[PDB]
Design a protein that fits this description.
Number of helices: 37
Bound molecules: barium ion, magnesium ion
Largest sheet: 6 strands, mixed
Strand order of the largest sheet: 9-6-1-2-3-10
CATH superfamily of the largest domain: Ribonuclease H-like superfamily/Ribonuclease H
Strand content: 5-15%
CATH class of the largest domain: Alpha Beta
Structural class: alpha+beta
Distance between the termini: 49 Å
CATH architecture of the largest domain: 2-Layer Sandwich
RNA sequence: GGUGCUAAGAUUAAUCAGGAUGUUUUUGUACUCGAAAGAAGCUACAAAGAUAAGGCUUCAUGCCGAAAUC
DNA sequence: GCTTCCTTATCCTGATTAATCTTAGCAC
DNA sequence: AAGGAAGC
């Protein structure tokens, strides 16, 4: 308490409120808001989804390149330039089963099998070819109306079936005597069915990649998840200990016993007493929780024992050396023949590894050569799987090293682990967040520490540092209610396991074979029991015999899709048949159920849902929302990440204010107090503005010095307050973010509307005209300009003689879909033809927008440019032209940077940079001022009037409009629309988006940089040339 | 109040292994025109190619590219 | 040139490590 | 949300 200043922090996923106040005077010395959108770090799910998607399409292509190399070595084909892409590979995969195929014809049968090699956890070619013949289609997720009923097929088969089929084809071809060796057949089946292990990942011995096993340092890990194991609580360079290890079992039971309270001289047990119990249970075969307590009664009365962990339902529980007991059951070994650190090691190998090929490898590379026999590793493999429930329990918070120190002291001194430990006895934000793999938390952590390191730097050491926390303080009636639910959840788990075992065996438990390769049944079963054994989309029943023995037929569907909601809870989850899940797509049951070919009706869903008591409240809300959710609309992931980030700063601070003897108090406030206090104090929260972070932090810094005020509150409601608040934003300099919309667009030459000659038009298509979203789109184009539909122009027969007659004679009514009302009656609208022929009509392409700025991705094949659109920007280089006295803004995009051919570096070249300079309006003899990145700050001053406004940058918008820029407000997230600006800029557009051009005659622009606290300083001296150092 | 060991309930994150699509190019068949040859490139199915722009070297269970670093 | 408007690809299967909150027992 | 052509 050497100083008098108090610091408070309101740490979020996308903001950090800052606030300093004198605990004595009550003055507000500093209020500040640091803003870094969490949206960028949360995009990591998009990065991982696209990285794994890239690896799958890469390996699917490689599988057919290896096949091309196989056909050269075997000498079956040498010139691949004349292979025909127009035969029937499904028919060739049936002819080859009995009759002989050409080498070319065989290459077509195997390549087709390699491109779709099925899942892996009548041959397929015969099942497929027959779907081709009777339905006209194989691929994907489509509907069939057989036996007078609507059913749904998908092109999914097991890789064992494809392998079986492939092997039959190739042997039948061996009977016809070519270069089909037996090594040819083996190598092909490896291409077809070969797969990597989840614990090895990508690469080989030469392709070193730190995502996978073959590390770039040279190490070759046995398992890529071993390095992800947590570290010791107290020896941070010691890996944790398996909970099935001997050491962790020993430590846990001792700390269990020392916590007991028994009728003895010291009310606790003795060193000699511990040893007998440790020794008794180690040597007794069956050991439960209460059977151990009966043994404690002999060494004394069971109801006289106190101080023990309890079950959710009130049963007592205790450690049992269970792992150890079940290990003595090994016949080809004996745990008694092994010491501690080879028994501890056996739990490390059997816990991290879950499959045969992984256990066998770790036993060789961690245990000395010849320490295990092929007969002994056999039993251990079968032993690991037979007791996955015990080895799937994880890792102790302590390393072995720590317990080896804390175990003898646990025997002798009779104190529990915490008592023992005490007796024994500028923050680097990057080091604190080195091994925290959560870019949201790690960012919002690194930001909060970068502030105190900069607040101390300019305010000296603080008296106190307060941090709002997201915890609870439930009362006795409230704390009782929580465990009431927690028990009811664990009960309905086992209620479903019981319900499952009664209907599968009739017995009380389920065989452990049943959970191999299906670790998710205990949750699939819990949903099968909530839904009353019913599929909530088809209405068909779910039999645990199919749910267990043919679980391919089911998928766990997110009710409200994950792409929109990001709700990963149980309430957003149902167990339904697979084909029903795929037909649903990215929809809610409301949007989807009625328009599904195979399914219930929304009405029958509404019926079943509120006619059941086993379902949940939150699950009933989510199953029936008639709400048109979408992702472009004004989550639990945000609450977990806040608690995480806040706690890391709290712990890291108190630990820092100890070993460095700075001795600054580090206190804590809760959310219920600061929100109540906010009402009591003067808290008028401004609308949608970043002010409330800086003021919340001041309440945080004030709720501490509370015991010791009116001046401060008076000051808080001051007129001149929301004006003095400072704001600071984290600039985004990164290149190589998402470069464009993923949609691959086609273009055509046409004349539309007020057009004189040909013009390159980007196409759009209406994916489905039998939906109210697909019909609406049709009418919009139809009223505006019928000819936009490529059909009208290139097939007027179908338009004038099929579509217009349908538009006239069909209900249109609440609005309804005319095309759908035809589908129910006559089926899919068919293209015009004579003999009743003509294919179905499901989609309609039209001419939509003219081609403008794009990225070209046009095949060498194409008769038309194929392009990418909405090209995301990187930075803007601001120049000044002394002649005209105007500014000249050059815009760079993510897609202007490239990996260079020769060198391989990711960069942009002066040649390309100068070509962009040219077309952007920047004169080759103009002076560079500064570069603007995302969320840099501008100052824009009128020179005619000297009126000025502070903006923050978004990007350089509109390439046709030179020197145009989209800007964003200094104090809030976005503009309202119609907001007024300096005279020369006018008002913002009534949509919010402030898109103005900064190339006018008398305007002066200056770059503004700020620290993490909001200390602004002007810039114009950034350099001679722009920075392009890569 | 903070914190530790344990256990469970709830919710998340990081990373790996795979499936089936979707987008688009080309080709073939069907549909429309033509006596055919073919034309058209609409509409449907199928195959083949591309699939963030783009790069790597070690020639393959090949590797990297939408995060972080400010 | 300036402002208004339209638009934007997904559903799953298997596995491991880690984190936070909460309730319980014990302790500093 | 923000890229960027449409619409005037
Ligand atoms: Ba586990
Ligand atoms: Ba309360
Ligand atoms: Ba569309
Ligand atoms: Ba976009
Ligand atoms: Ba506590
Ligand atoms: Ba042609
Ligand atoms: Ba394809
Ligand atoms: Ba590529
Ligand atoms: Ba114009
Ligand atoms: Ba557009
Ligand atoms: Mg779904």
């Amino acid at each position: 308490m050497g100083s008098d200043l108090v610091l408070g922090l309101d740490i979020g996923i996308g903001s950090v409120g800052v606030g300093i106040l004198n605990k004595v005077t009550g003055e507000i010395i500093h209020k500040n808001s640091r803003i870094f959108p969490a949206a960028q770090a949360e995009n990591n799910l998009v990065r991982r989804t696209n990285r794994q998607g890239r690896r799958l399409a890469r390996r699917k292509k490689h599988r057919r390149v290896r096949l091309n190399r196989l056909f050269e070595e075997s000498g079956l084909i040498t010139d691949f330039t004349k292979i025909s892409i127009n035969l029937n590979p499904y028919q060739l995969r049936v002819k080859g089963l009995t009759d002989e195929l050409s080498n070319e014809e065989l290459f077509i049968a195997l390549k087709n099998m390699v491109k779709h090699r099925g899942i892996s956890y009548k041959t397929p070619g015969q099942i497929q070819l027959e779907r081709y013949q009777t339905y006209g289609q194989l691929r994907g997720d489509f509907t069939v109306e057989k036996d007078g009923k609507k059913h749904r097929l998908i092109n999914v088969f097991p890789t064992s079936a494809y392998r079986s089929e492939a092997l039959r084809i190739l042997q039948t071809q061996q009977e016809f005597n070519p270069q089909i060796t037996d090594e040819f057949i083996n190598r092909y089946l490896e291409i077809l069915t070969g797969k990597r292990k989840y614990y090895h990942g990508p690469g080989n011995e030469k392709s070193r990649t730190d995502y996978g096993r073959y590390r770039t340092s040279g190490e070759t890990l046995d398992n890529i998840f071993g390095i992800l194991i947590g570290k010791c609580t107290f020896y941070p360079d010691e890996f944790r200990a398996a909970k099935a290890s001997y050491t962790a079992q020993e430590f846990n039971l001792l700390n269990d016993l020392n916590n007991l309270t028994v009728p003895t001289e010291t009310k606790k047990l003795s060193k000699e007493q511990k040893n007998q119990i440790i020794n008794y249970v180690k040597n007794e075969k069956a050991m439960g929780p209460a059977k151990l307590f009966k043994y404690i009664a002999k060494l004394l009365d069971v109801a006289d024992i106190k101080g023990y962990r309890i079950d959710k339902s009130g049963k007592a529980e205790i450690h049992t050396f269970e792992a150890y007991r079940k290990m003595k059951t090994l016949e080809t070994l004996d745990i008694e023949q092994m010491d501690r650190e080879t028994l501890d090691k056996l739990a490390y190998v059997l816990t991290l590894n879950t499959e045969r090929e992984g256990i066998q490898e770790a036993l060789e590379h961690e245990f000395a050569d010849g320490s295990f026999s092929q007969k002994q590793v056999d039993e251990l493999v079968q032993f690991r799987k037979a007791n996955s429930s015990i080895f799937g329990k994880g890792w102790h918070n302590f390393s072995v090293k720590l317990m080896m120190e804390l175990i003898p002291e646990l025997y002798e001194t009779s104190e529990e682990q915490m008592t023992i430990l005490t007796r024994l006895g500028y923050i680097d934000e990057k080091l604190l967040t080195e091994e925290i793999y959560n870019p949201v938390v790690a960012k919002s952590v690194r930001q909060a520490i970068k502030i105190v390191n900069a607040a101390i730097k300019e305010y000296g050491d603080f008296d106190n540092i307060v941090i709002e926390m997201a915890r609870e303080t439930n009362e006795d009636d409230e704390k009782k209610a929580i465990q009431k639910i927690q028990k009811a959840n664990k009960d309905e788990k086992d209620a479903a396991m019981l319900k499952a075992a009664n209907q599968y065996n009739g017995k009380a438990e389920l065989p452990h074979s049943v959970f191999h390769g299906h670790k998710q049944l205990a949750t699939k079963i819990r949903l099968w029991h909530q839904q009353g054994e019913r599929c909530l989309y088809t209405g068909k029943t779910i039999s645990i015999h199919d749910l267990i023995n043919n679980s391919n037929q089911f998928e766990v569907d997110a009710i409200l899709p994950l792409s929109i909601t990001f709700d990963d809870s149980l309430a957003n989850k149902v167990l339904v048949y697979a084909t029903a899940n795929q037909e649903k797509g990215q929809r809610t049951p409301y949007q989807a159920l009625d328009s599904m070919d195979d399914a219930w009706s929304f009405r029958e869903l509404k019926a079943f849902v509120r006619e059941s008591k086993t379902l949940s409240n939150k699950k009933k809300e989510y199953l029936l929302t008639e709400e048109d959710i979408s992702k472009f609309d004004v989550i639990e992931r945000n609450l977990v990440d806040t608690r995480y980030a806040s706690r890391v700063v709290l712990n890291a601070l108190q630990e820092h204010f100890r070993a460095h003897k700075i001795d600054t108090k580090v206190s804590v406030v809760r959310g219920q107090f600061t929100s109540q206090l906010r009402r009591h104090w003067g808290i008028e929260k401004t609308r949608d503005t970043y002010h409330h972070h800086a003021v919340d932090a001041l309440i945080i810094a004030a709720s501490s010095q509370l015991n010791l005020y009116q001046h401060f509150v008076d000051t808080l409601k001051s007129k001149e307050f929301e004006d003095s608040i400072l704001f600071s934003y984290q600039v985004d300099s990164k290149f190589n973010r998402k470069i464009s919309d993923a949609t691959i667009y086609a273009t055509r030459q046409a004349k539309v509307g007020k057009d004189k000659a040909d013009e390159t038009y980007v196409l759009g298509k209406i994916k489905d005209i039998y939906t109210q979203d697909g019909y609406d789109a049709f009418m919009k184009i139809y009223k505006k300009d019928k000819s936009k539909f490529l059909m009208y122009r290139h097939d007027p027969q179908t338009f004038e003689k099929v579509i217009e007659p349908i538009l006239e004679n069909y209900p249109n009514k609440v609005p309804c879909n005319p095309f759908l009302k035809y589908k129910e009656e006559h089926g899919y609208i068919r293209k015009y033809s004579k003999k009743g022929n003509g294919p179905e009509i499901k989609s309609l392409k039209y001419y939509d927008s003219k081609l403008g700025n794009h990225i070209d991705i046009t095949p060498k094949d194409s008769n038309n440019k194929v392009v990418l659109q909405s090209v995301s920007p990187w930075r803007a280089d601001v120049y000044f032209n002394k002649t005209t006295g105007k500014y000249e803004i050059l815009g760079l995009k993510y897609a202007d940077l490239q990996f260079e051919k020769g060198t391989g570096t990711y960069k942009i070249s002066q040649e390309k940079y100068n070509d962009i300079k040219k077309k952007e309006g920047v004169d080759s003899d103009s002076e560079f001022k500064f570069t603007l990145y995302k969320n840099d700050l501008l100052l824009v001053k009128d020179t005619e009037t000297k009126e000025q406004q502070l903006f923050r940058f978004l990007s350089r918008t509109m390439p046709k409009q030179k020197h145009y820029v989209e800007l964003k407000p200094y104090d809030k997230q976005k503009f309202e629309g119609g907001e007024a600006l300096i005279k020369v800029l006018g008002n913002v557009a009534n949509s919010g988006q402030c898109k103005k051009g900064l190339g006018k005659s008398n305007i002066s622009i200056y770059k503004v940089r700020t620290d993490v606290l909001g200390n602004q300083h002007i810039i114009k001296n950034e350099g001679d040339k722009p920075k392009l150092d890569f």
